[PDB]
Write a protein that binds this ligand. Structure first.
Ligand SMILES: COc1ccc(CCNCCc2ccc(O)c(O)c2)cc1
Length: 155
């Protein structure tokens, strides 16, 4: 057995869903993640063209937990503006977690408005629930949402 946990974040953004989705689905996004989020990375290696199936090997500078993990783009759905990115090696998988999936859904609210609905689902062995609970937060998805919003809006 494992236990399933799901955590959620929303950001309202004063830009269209189309504009926001342009950035989340840009095939160059992975390779530019260090520009988008400066000072995070020690190393970033990308296998793939940025579309579905791309693997990102991410190593973070000392003092960051986790230190390294591999991520894979599982879904990049233009019709529903839905992105799924799986932690496939390392990271929380070395802390009793057997499944880790980030979902990002860009939902239109108005002509020039949308909500970025980010969530994390993980499956954890029961004896590890207490250990991973404070470590797995929406922090990284909220950081990405904040930075994408700012990149679209700010002049
Ligand atoms: C420094 O920036 C980071 C951004 C996000 C994370 C969490 C893992 N990423 C989950 C969603 C995601 C990851 C990579 C992508 O290229 C992407 O488009 C979407 C880590 C670091």
């Amino acid at each position: 057995s494992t236990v399933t946990k799901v955590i959620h974040h929303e950001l309202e953004v004063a830009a269209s869903a189309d504009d926001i989705w342009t950035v989340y689905s840009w095939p160059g996004l992975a390779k530019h993640l260090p520009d988008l989020l400066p000072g995070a990375f020690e190393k970033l290696e990308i296998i793939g063209d940025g579309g579905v199936g791309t693997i990102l090997d991410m190593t973070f500078v000392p003092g960051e937990f986790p230190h390294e993990y591999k991520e894979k783009f599982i879904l990049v759905d233009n019709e529903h503006r839905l992105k799924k990115v799986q932690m496939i090696e390392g990271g929380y998988l070395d802390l009793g977690v057997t499944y880790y999936m980030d979902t990002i859904h860009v939902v239109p609210t108005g002509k020039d408005s949308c909500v970025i609905k980010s969530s994390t689902e993980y499956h954890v062995k029961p004896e590890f629930v207490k250990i991973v609970e404070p470590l797995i937060t929406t922090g990284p998805l909220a950081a990405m949402a904040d930075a994408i919003s700012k990149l679209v809006l700010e002049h």
